[PDB]
Amino acid sequence: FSRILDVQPRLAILLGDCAVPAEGRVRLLRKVLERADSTVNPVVVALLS
Amino acid sequence: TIPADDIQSAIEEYVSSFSREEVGTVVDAGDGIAHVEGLPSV
Amino acid sequence: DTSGRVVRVTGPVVDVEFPRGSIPELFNALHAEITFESLAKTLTLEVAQHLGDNLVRTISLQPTDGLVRGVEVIDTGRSISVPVGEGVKGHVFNALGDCLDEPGYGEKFEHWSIHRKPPAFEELEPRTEMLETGLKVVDLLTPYVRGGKIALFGGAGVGKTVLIQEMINRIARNFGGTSVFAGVGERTREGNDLWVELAEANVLKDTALVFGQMDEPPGTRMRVALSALTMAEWFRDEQGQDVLLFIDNIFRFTQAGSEVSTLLGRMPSAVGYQPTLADEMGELQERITSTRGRSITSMQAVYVPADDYTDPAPATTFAHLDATTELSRAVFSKGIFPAVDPLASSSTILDPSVVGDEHYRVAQEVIRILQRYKDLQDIIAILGIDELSEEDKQLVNRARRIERFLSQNMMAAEQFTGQPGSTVPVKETIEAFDRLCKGDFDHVPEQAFFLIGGLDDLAKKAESLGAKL
Ligand SMILES: Nc1ncnc2c1ncn2[C@@H]1O[C@H](COP(=O)(O)OP(=O)(O)O)[C@@H](O)[C@H]1O
Numbered sequence: 001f002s003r004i005l006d007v008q009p010r011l012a013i014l015l016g017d018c019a020v021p022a023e024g025r026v027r028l029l030r031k032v033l034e035r036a037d038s039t040v041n042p043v044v045v046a047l048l049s
Numbered sequence: 050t051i052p053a054d055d056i057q058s059a060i061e062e063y064v065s066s067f068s069r070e071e072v073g074t075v076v077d078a079g080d081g082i083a084h085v086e087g088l089p090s091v
Numbered sequence: 092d093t094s095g096r097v098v099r100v101t102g103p104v105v106d107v108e109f110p111r112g113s114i115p116e117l118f119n120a121l122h123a124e125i126t127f128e129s130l131a132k133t134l135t136l137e138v139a140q141h142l143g144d145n146l147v148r149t150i151s152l153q154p155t156d157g158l159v160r161g162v163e164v165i166d167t168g169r170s171i172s173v174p175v176g177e178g179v180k181g182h183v184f185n186a187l188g189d190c191l192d193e194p195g196y197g198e199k200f201e202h203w204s205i206h207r208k209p210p211a212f213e214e215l216e217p218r219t220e221m222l223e224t225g226l227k228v229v230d231l232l233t234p235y236v237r238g239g240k241i242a243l244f245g246g247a248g249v250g251k252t253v254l255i256q257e258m259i260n261r262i263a264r265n266f267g268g269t270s271v272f273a274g275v276g277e278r279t280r281e282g283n284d285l286w287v288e289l290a291e292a293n294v295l296k297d298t299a300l301v302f303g304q305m306d307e308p309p310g311t312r313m314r315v316a317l318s319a320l321t322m323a324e325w326f327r328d329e330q331g332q333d334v335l336l337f338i339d340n341i342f343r344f345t346q347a348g349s350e351v352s353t354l355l356g357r358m359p360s361a362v363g364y365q366p367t368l369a370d371e372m373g374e375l376q377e378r379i380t381s382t383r384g385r386s387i388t389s390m391q392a393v394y395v396p397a398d399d400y401t402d403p404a405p406a407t408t409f410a411h412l413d414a415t416t417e418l419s420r421a422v423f424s425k426g427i428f429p430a431v432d433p434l435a436s437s438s439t440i441l442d443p444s445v446v447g448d449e450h451y452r453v454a455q456e457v458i459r460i461l462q463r464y465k466d467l468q469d470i471i472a473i474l475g476i477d478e479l480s481e482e483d484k485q486l487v488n489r490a491r492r493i494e495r496f497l498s499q500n501m502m503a504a505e506q507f508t509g510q511p512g513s514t515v516p517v518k519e520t521i522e523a524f525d526r527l528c529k530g531d532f533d534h535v536p537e538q539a540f541f542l543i544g545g546l547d548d549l550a551k552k553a554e555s556l557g558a559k560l
């Protein structure tokens with residue numbers, strides 16, 4: 001997921017606007033993550049959340 | 050094995066689901082000088 | 092995308108943030124937009140520093156009034172480029188290469204970066220050929236070098252612009268090459284005056300004018316000299332024919348560099364100048380040069396702040412020149428024009444082997460007489476001239492007549508006196524001042540030496556005052 005994220009910086013920077021209320025970012029994050037859940041673990045979801 | 054999905058409107062939904070008017074809250078003042086937080090479009 | 096975002100706008104310095112891996116190189120030109128309807132424009136920002144965490148500190152070349160945080164910044168991927176070629180002759184340009192008297196002209200020319208390296212040490216060769224102007228004091232005491240570097244050092248409003256227009260009239264009017272004029276941070280009235288003057292003297296078809304004036308932000312005044320210098324470097328390296336390069340107030344380059352220095356986050360040096368004063372000046376001045384076989388006769392006006400020749404900016408510019416004509420306000424106050432200080436002005440070709448031994452001997456005797464007069468002046472002021480020797484009274488008379496005979500009626504001063512100017516060959520100057528130092532004119536009054544040409548005009552004005560010669 002590191003590889004997944006950093007070479008896609010346009011959405012990586014998106015998860016960076018701290019001025020946005022915080023949930024907003026993970027709000028999008030879950031949107032992409034369980035976009036399909038072959039991120040087969042939930043602990044990973046909790047950590048990066 | 051990778052989520053090579055790249056559903057981009059997944060991103061569209063988030064950012065474009067975001068009028069009133071920008072209002073700055075004076076943060077500190079004194080001696081004729083005032084700092085103003087907010088107002089992202091001055 | 093991979094475009095940036097404005098983060099801070101503090102005057103002419105703007106910080107931008109780029110995505111990781113898309114940081115622009117140093118000295119790139121970025122475009123931003125000002126959309127406010129009355130001040131709408133396109134800002135060009137030059138990348139000055141890499142701050143870290145993808146931030147980039149840049150200097151705007153236009154006023155930032157109306158810029159908003161978070162607007163998009165486009166990276167052009169290259170430095171500031173200016174047009175080059177035989178097509179820039181006869182036109183006026185910005186510091187950014189935009190033609191002023193014909194907007195849109197030069198968009199299709201070859202474009203050259205305004206950031207280049209100086210020529211390598213193996214292509215440099217000393218120039219020791221005299222460039223004869225026609226002014227008495229210049230041809231005698233500071234003979235100009237042809238293909239070398241010349242300056243007019245001066246305080247605020249002594250003679251610099253008038254003398255540089257005089258040298259445009261003398262050297263460039265009958266010149267067999269290409270001239271480039273860089274007005275670096277000077278008055279716009281003077282720029283328009285020079286434009287019209289070159290247009291009526293038919294010198295404009297051989298000149299490329301580049302103007303960044305005092306109303307411009309410090310970025311324009313930092314880069315206009317580099318723009319005009321890039322045009323001159325093209326004329327020298329590719330076309331290869333006898334470039335002339337005038338620069339009105341190269342000091343404005345250093346001053347603009349010092350106006351943004353602390354905003355860029357640099358501790359100030361001695362007199363409030365940027366810590367990088369000498370090195371920026373050397374990076375710019377070492378490009379203003381002639382290589383082996385390729386000539387650039389450079390001439391720069393150098394403002395001396397508050398008539399202080401110990402100020403770090405002129406003190407650093409001194410080391411870059413072959414001939415320095417130093418104007419003084421003590422000579423300006425006496426009505427002597429050009430207000431050249433003969434005891435401080437210098438030249439490297441004032442050498443017995445270059446200008447000949449008669450020229451050198453006459454110049455040395457003039458300088459010795461004037462130095463002795465300066466040594467006596469205070470005694471004369473307090474105790475009176477009658478307390479001196481007869482040796483010294485003779486020397487004082489000769490020295491006053493010499494100080495007055497160095498002045499001249501210049502062609503570019505007909506607006507301040509109404510009297511047309513004159514040209515004096517160098518041999519006539521040498522003969523005249525030889526006679527002056529020997530004492531052949533000790534009977535002619537002090538005047539009739541004041542604002543005249545050669546010896547025949549001296550005779551005419553002496554008879555107009557009742558004297559022989
Ligand atoms: N040779 C001269 N004869 C008469 N007046 C002169 C001469 N040189 C300079 N001046 C006067 O000095 C003033 C300022 O000269 P200028 O060279 O423009 O100053 P600066 O060196 O600050 O550019 C001019 O307005 C002019 O009136």
Ligand SMILES: [Mg+2]
Pocket residue numbers: 251252277340392
């Ligand atoms: Mg001037």
